Design a protein around this ligand. Structure first.
Ligand SMILES: *CCC(=O)N1CCN(c2ncnc3cc(-c4ccccc4F)c(Cl)cc23)CC1
Ligand SMILES: Nc1nc2c(ncn2[C@@H]2O[C@H](COP(=O)(O)OP(=O)(O)O)[C@@H](O)[C@H]2O)c(=O)[nH]1
Ligand SMILES: [Mg+2]
Length: 169
């Protein structure tokens, strides 16, 4: 039976949670995506030779009950924590997101990956070393991505699957 990995993409508004998710799934870059739209996507991929199904929730601004969000929080196995490299505040927000994840799973050891998105942009205010230092502190990988050019998009989600596989075994 095909293994499924339940992934949840989190981070502050505008960092590119949706654009990352839509790029991985539909192979195009979206200029606007309703920041209030929270949806789940599936895709069949092969990762290190294992055919498997990514089940991804793109979190958003939800003042309303989502039965589907409840299930991904309860049963999600890995988190993509996204900030944007031209948004210092979104980088400062990461710690908040990591603490929420630990609380949701009631553990210090939750599979997650730090993603620095929008690295196609020149106006960079969060440098790579800051992000590596934070990732090293958390004990998690750090990947630089561009939802616009596709740089690191497969790598970020695939690295997350690999962290989940290690968590299992
Ligand atoms: C621009 C709209 C958008 O993308 N968002 C608005 C809501 N966000 C938000 N703000 C603060 N705190 C959180 C915390 C969570 C969260 C809860 C539990 C576990 C993991 C986790 F990330 C989420 Cl999903 C969104 C938050 C950002 C998204
Ligand atoms: N240049 C550039 N723009 C991006 C990138 N990712 C997202 N954006 C833009 O940033 C805005 C916010 O993206 P969105 O995915 O809605 O952020 P979200 O609220 O976290 O899901 C959108 O207009 C995207 O077109 C990127 O990697 N590079
Ligand atoms: Mg969005």
């Amino acid at each position: 039976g095909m293994t499924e990995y339940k992934l949840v993409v989190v981070g502050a508004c505008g960092v590119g949670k949706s654009a990352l998710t839509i790029q991985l799934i539909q192979n195009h870059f979206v200029d606007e995506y309703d920041p209030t739209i929270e949806d789940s996507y599936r895709k069949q991929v092969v990762i290190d030779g294992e055919t498997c199904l990514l089940d991804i929730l793109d979190t958003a601004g939800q003042e309303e009950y989502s039965a589907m969000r409840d299930q991904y929080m309860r049963t999600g196995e890995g988190f993509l924590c996204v900030f944007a490299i031209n948004n210092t505040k979104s980088f400062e927000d990461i710690h908040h997101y990591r603490e929420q994840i630990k609380r949701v799973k009631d553990s210090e050891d939750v599979p997650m990956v730090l993603v620095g998105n929008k690295c196609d942009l020149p106006s960079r205010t969060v440098d790579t070393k800051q992000a590596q230092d934070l990732a090293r502190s958390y004990g998690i990988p750090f990947i630089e991505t561009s939802a616009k050019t596709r740089q690191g998009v497969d790598d970020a989600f695939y690295t997350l699957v690999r962290e989940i596989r290690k968590h299992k075994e």
